[PDB]
């Protein structure tokens, strides 16, 4: 576990707040106008502060146009945003140019453990009743408790819209809540002060300015602008995951580290920053472990190095080393490796974190910017049971005061001890038990607030005269003999749980022998499993009154519908299957039931079956390998692991590419040598093509004294065995591993005769007609002449599997089907579409725009149709992926090197980062995608699903084909218009004027 796990090249900087602010705002719209959030929900204000915190003049204009254009008459929710929005657009105009604060709004929740009379135990954290604000929390924190003895009422849970106006106003306090501290009474959150005897006693004044700064931090919120923080140990739902959310709101520049670096761990941290991080806030997620000395000797160097040396250029202002590993059940005779390891994560490396920011503080000469340390301490010093060596770990941290005065690092580090109080999360079922002893237990977000108030500009000075302790313990040092007082509260919760488990089952069993289960089975209700009912996703047609309203009233009778193009079907064969099962992992991030059965059927996991299997009539999905029946409710459990394991961008599976193994790219070489005695002969097989290399280089004897005949030769040739060597571009977005056309109804001959890419294109054209209510292509000919069904499809290279067969395979001397050139084309891939489905009838175009072919295809497809050449046109595009193509793209340095993505700790499912600071190139995938576009009025008298209205398509280029790999202005010309004189109004833009002319 001491294995090094951090790379300077492995960091991950999140800073683009200026964007997430316009995202979070727009996100509010579509919860409020969709009633997902109501005017009473705590998040509308717990979110409005996160967007205020990210205020800019650009964002003001972003919500000005959005609010000022929200038509409130559309519904009551449209009024709820029209009114709430205007607050933010006026609130954000004030807190512009002011430092961003965090102001925690969540309802503080208390513990609540309830056992069923069925004997089933469950823990719930319900919202406390006496404290519904954070100010209510800090006062009941000040009043102490009955054992610790020796109101601006707002619209929080009532009207969140009017509270929005209260966020920017600085609701100043007059009666300081530090006055509410009763004499002889210790509050719940008190700082401490060493006495000349040596101990630490509750000081009242020194614990007053802490505690009111909290209460100030709760009405106005605290800002952490210009902070620079390291914080280790921040797992999802952990102690310091909630300080991170607070550090980030304040505008802190943070370093968070993680032990388990993966993609779900950063897509976590991405959602943290996109939600919370405010102007100037910055977090870096690096991989890390505390227990590796060679890894703290390297994380701080990475933080104290210039952005030229690859470093970070920062300087720490606060350190929060919270990172710990659990160990339980470890008593004194069980203390071993796992503990001796945990001692290093907590003690001797938190020591060498501080012991090694000084070396950097002191080499620069920085002695006026000291880094406040926040040691997470605890009152548990061997008072609980067998926590392992967790005690003398966190007990041997208050010795960090005997040194701030003794040693030399006082100017660069300032200790600020803290307390793990009783925070729930990370034993959770007896919290409600203890709180009956006048003891407070903290939610994580609550203990977040406390440690976070330990950074308040007030305390920061207070730490900077003397090391402070900050007892954030609810009073758990007062309840005496807490160990078994604890161990009893839970030993009772298992009795009262298990006895109502045993008594309940036997009485239910008693009820089965006096009445019998013959009548008790009618009480076992029949409960039905949903079945997979795929859909076609036809556009819904709202009634005519609804649509005659959305369009201008003058529009009717004003369009030549023969000239309005319109998409009518579409389909796809990607790495995610059809266009129905990619829109799921696109929009919804995970598969439905109808998406998991379809991805199960097109990957050849489940089959169908009706008839009699196991004698019994089985009708429904079955295994395909074992043929053993499987219900569509147990398919997401049984397969979703592999379906997602083998779909989308993946490490390249070689058997999808007939042996292409990117770690063994094959090439051409020669071999090692011998002791010299060698002329060299031949045999009697292929003398016929193969006879014109050498020359006249023999020691012939044409006299029959020998008997068997072979050309006699010597050194000086070049010959015949290829060889192999490694490669880097190592992932591509395959089609889901296992995809056979056989599944769709494509014959076995065609797949053996046709190139893979065409084999994709057919599957997409049937589904595109399926998706258009055209189940057999000939129905087209009921309405249109056979010569008016076009095709304007095209590929990139196309047929690259055949070019591989002739330009590369044929001279390798292996069987290549002699029809091979016919498939290499791009013309002859939309041919089989006509050869096998359509029977269409003209000169049929075929674009090849290296990557923009599929828009060009729509361009020529549209101009074809309103020219009058065709009423119906297939458009679209398709291409494949093999090594003849990727390797070329490799040496162009166009697709992302994969090894240098495995050294950025990037993962396969994330190496395609469009519009990203750390983008490195792209990822070639394989597949097809087509769509049937028709005239309009034909679609209305044919009765087909109209999905869109291609109102414009236009390809553009600079000039002569000059230099391919660089893009340019080209398309900007689709906006060429003349603004020389705009003072007068252009009548043609109005419809009420164009309607009169018509």
């Amino acid at each position: 576990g001491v294995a090094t796990s951090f790379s300077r090249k492995k960091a991950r900087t999140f800073d683009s707040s200026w964007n997430w602010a316009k995202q979070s705002l727009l996100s509010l719209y579509f919860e409020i106008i969709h009633g997902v959030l109501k005017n009473v929900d705590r998040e509308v204000v717990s979110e409005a502060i996160n967007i205020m915190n990210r205020s800019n003049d650009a964002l003001i204009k972003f919500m000005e146009y959005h609010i000022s254009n929200t038509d409130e008459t559309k519904g009551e929710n449209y009024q709820l945003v029209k009114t709430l929005g205007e607050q933010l657009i006026e609130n954000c105009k004030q807190v512009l140019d002011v430092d961003p604060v965090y102001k925690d709004v969540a309802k503080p929740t208390g513990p609540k453990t309830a056992i069923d009379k069925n004997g089933n135990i469950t823990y719930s954290e319900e919202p406390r009743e006496k404290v519904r604000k954070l100010s209510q929390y800090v006062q009941e924190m000040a009043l102490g408790g009955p054992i610790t003895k020796e109101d601006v009422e707002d619209a929080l849970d009532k009207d969140s819209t009017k509270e929005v106006a209260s966020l920017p106003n600085k609701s100043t306090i007059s009666k300081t809540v530090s006055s509410t501290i009763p004499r002889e009474t210790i509050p719940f959150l008190h700082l401490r002060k060493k006495t000349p005897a040596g101990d630490w006693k509750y000081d009242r004044q020194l614990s007053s300015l802490f505690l009111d700064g909290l209460e100030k931090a709760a009405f106005n919120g605290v800002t952490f602008k210009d902070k620079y923080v390291l914080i280790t140990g921040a797992g999802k739902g952990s102690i310091g995951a909630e300080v991170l959310q607070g550090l980030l709101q304040g505008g802190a520049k943070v370093v968070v580290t993680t032990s388990r670096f993966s993609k779900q761990v950063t897509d976590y941290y991405q959602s943290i920053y996109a939600k919370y991080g405010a102007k100037g806030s910055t977090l870096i997620v690096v991989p890390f472990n505390q227990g590796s000395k060679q890894d703290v000797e390297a994380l701080i160097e990475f933080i104290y190095d210039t952005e030229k040396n690859g470093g970070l250029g920062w300087d720490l202002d606060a350190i929060i080393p919270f990172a710990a590993i659990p160990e339980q059940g470890i008593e004194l005779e069980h203390i071993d490796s796992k503990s001796e390891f945990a001692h290093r994560i907590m003690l001797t490396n938190i020591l060498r974190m501080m012991g090694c920011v000084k070396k950097q503080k002191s080499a620069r000469g920085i002695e006026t910017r000291p880094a406040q340390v926040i040691l997470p301490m605890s009152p548990n010093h061997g008072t609980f049971g067998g926590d392992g060596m967790y005690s003398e770990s966190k007990l041997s941290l208050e010795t960090l005061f005997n040194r701030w005065h003794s040693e030399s690092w006082a100017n660069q580090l300032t200790v600020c001890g803290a307390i793990i109080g009783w925070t729930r999360g990370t034993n959770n079922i007896i919290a409600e038990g203890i709180e009956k002893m006048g003891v407070r237990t903290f939610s994580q977000k609550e203990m977040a607030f406390n440690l976070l108030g330990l950074l308040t500009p007030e305390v920061v000075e207070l730490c900077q005269k003397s090391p402070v302790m900050a007892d954030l313990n609810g009073g758990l040092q007062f309840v005496p003999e807490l160990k078994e007082f604890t161990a009893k509260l839970r030993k009772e919760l298992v009795e009262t749980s298990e006895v109502r488990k045993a008594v309940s089952i036997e009485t239910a069993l008693e009820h089965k022998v006096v009445n019998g289960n013959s009548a008790d089975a009618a009480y076992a209700q029949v409960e039905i499993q949903p079945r997979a009912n795929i859909q076609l996703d036809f556009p819904e047609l709202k009634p005519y009154k609804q649509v005659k309203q959305i369009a201008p009233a003058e529009l009717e009778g004003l369009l030549d519908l023969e000239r309005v193009i319109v998409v009518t079907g579409f389909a796809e064969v990607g790495p995610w299957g059809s266009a129905r099962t990619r829109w799921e992992m696109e929009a919804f991030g995970e598969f439905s039931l109808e998406g998991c059965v379809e991805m199960a059927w097109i990957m050849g996991f489940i089959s169908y079956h009706n008839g009699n299997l196991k004698g019994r009539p089985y009708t429904g999905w079955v295994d395909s390998k074992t043929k053993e029946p499987v219900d569509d409710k147990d398919v997401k459990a049984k397969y979703e692991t592999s379906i997602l394991e083998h779909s989308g961008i993946r490490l390249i599976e070689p058997e999808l590419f007939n042996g292409y193994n990117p770690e063994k790219k094959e090439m051409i070489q020669e071999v090692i040598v011998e002791e010299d005695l060698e002329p060299f002969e031949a045999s009697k097989e292929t003398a016929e093509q193969f006879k014109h290399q050498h020359g006249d280089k023999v020691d012939i004897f044409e006299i029959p004294e020998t008997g068997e005949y072979s050309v006699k030769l010597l050194k000086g040739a070049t010959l015949y065995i290829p060889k192999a060597l490694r490669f880097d571009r190592l992932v591509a977005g395959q089609i889901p591993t296992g995809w056979n056309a056989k599944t769709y109804g494509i014959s076995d001959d065609i797949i053996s005769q046709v190139d893979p890419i065409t084999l994709f294109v057919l599957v997409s054209v049937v589904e595109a007609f399926i998706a258009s209510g055209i189940t057999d292509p000939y129905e087209m000919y009921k309405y249109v002449h056979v010569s008016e069904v076009g095709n304007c499809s095209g590929s990139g290279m196309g047929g690259v599997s055949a070019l591989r067969g002739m330009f590369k395979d044929r001279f390798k001397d292996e069987p290549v089907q002699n029809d091979i050139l016919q498939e290499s084309f791009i013309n002859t891939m939309s041919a089989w579409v006509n050869m096998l489905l359509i029977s269409s009838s003209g000169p049929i175009k075929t674009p090849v725009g290296a990557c923009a072919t599929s828009v060009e295809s729509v361009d020529i497809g549209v101009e074809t149709i309103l020219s009058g050449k065709a009423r119906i046109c297939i458009v679209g595009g398709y291409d494949d992926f093999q090594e003849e193509g990727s390797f070329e793209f490799g040496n162009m340095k166009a697709t992302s090197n994969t090894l240098e993505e495995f050294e950025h700790g990037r993962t396969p499912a994330e190496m395609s980062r469009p519009a990203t600071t750390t983008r490195n190139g792209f990822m070639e995938a394989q597949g097809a995608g087509i769509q049937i576009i028709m005239q309009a009025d034909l679609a209305l008298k044919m009765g087909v699903p109209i999905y869109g209205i291609v109102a414009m398509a236009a390809t553009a280029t600079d000039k002569i084909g000059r230099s391919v790999p660089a893009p340019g202005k080209g398309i900007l010309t689709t906006a060429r218009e003349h603004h020389s004189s705009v003072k007068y109004a252009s009548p043609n833009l109005n419809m009420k004027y164009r309607k009169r002319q018509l």
């Binding site: 316009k22 076609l536 829109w583 109209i946 869109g948 218009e977």
Partner: protein, 145 residues
């Protein structure tokens, strides 16, 4: 992406798009990759999913959009899905080797039916309703067998 975003800005900057009304960047390729030729037909394919769904997917692999992209004040770069109240039009732009650009925009189908008389519309309505069912039938027989 530096250039594609650049050019979208001017054609909104030039056409007088309202200040503070950016278009929303949908980056389909994070899931699928780059199907060298099939690209604009995956992203036109998705763009139609959107018009009828009102659901704008997000770049679930967008760690940190580059600062140099901030100067383009006419474009967002989402990272979470966004159930809107309805998209009215989508622009599909695409670029490739050889300076072949290409930008096609799609309008929402419902703007069409505003151009036809009523009796013809609900006539077409019944017509599709029947085809939908038939297509449902055929899709399931084939899918099975």
């Amino acid at each position: 992406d530096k250039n594609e975003s650049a050019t979208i800005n001017e054609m909104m900057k030039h056409l007088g798009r309202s200040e503070g009304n950016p278009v929303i960047g949908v980056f389909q390729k994070f899931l699928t990759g780059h199907p060298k030729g099939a690209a604009g037909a995956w992203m036109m394919n998705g763009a139609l999913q959107i018009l009828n769904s009102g659901i704008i997917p997000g770049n679930r692999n967008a760690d940190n959009v580059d600062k140099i992209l901030e100067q383009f004040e006419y474009v967002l770069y989402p990272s979470k899905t966004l159930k809107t109240d309805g998209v009215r039009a989508v622009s599909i732009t695409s670029f490739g080797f050889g300076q072949k650009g290409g930008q096609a925009i799609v309008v929402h189908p419902d703007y069409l039916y505003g151009a036809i008389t009523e009796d013809r519309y609900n006539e077409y309505v019944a017509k599709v309703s029947a085809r939908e069912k038939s297509a449902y039938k055929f899709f399931h027989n084939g899918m099975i067998y």
